[PDB]
């Protein structure tokens, strides 16, 4: 398991979550719905050395 992280760049919106996943595409698809929910939508990216994703409006 590991932590990832997403950084949410948005237009109103500067936020951060966290979640505890078995790998980075099942990070990423809580993250794709945790930005829905927030009202952000972008340009992804994710750094596999900080296991951080960034959606940035």
Do not use: C, Q, R, S
Request: no cysteine; net charge negative; glycine share 8%.
């Amino acid at each position: 398991m590991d932590t990832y992280k997403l950084i949410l760049n948005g237009k109103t919106l500067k936020g951060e979550t966290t979640t505890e996943a078995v790998d980075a595409a099942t990070a990423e698809k809580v993250f794709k719905h945790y930005a829905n929910e927030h009202g952000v939508h972008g340009h992804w990216t994710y750094d596999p050395e900080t296991k951080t994703f960034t959606v940035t409006e």
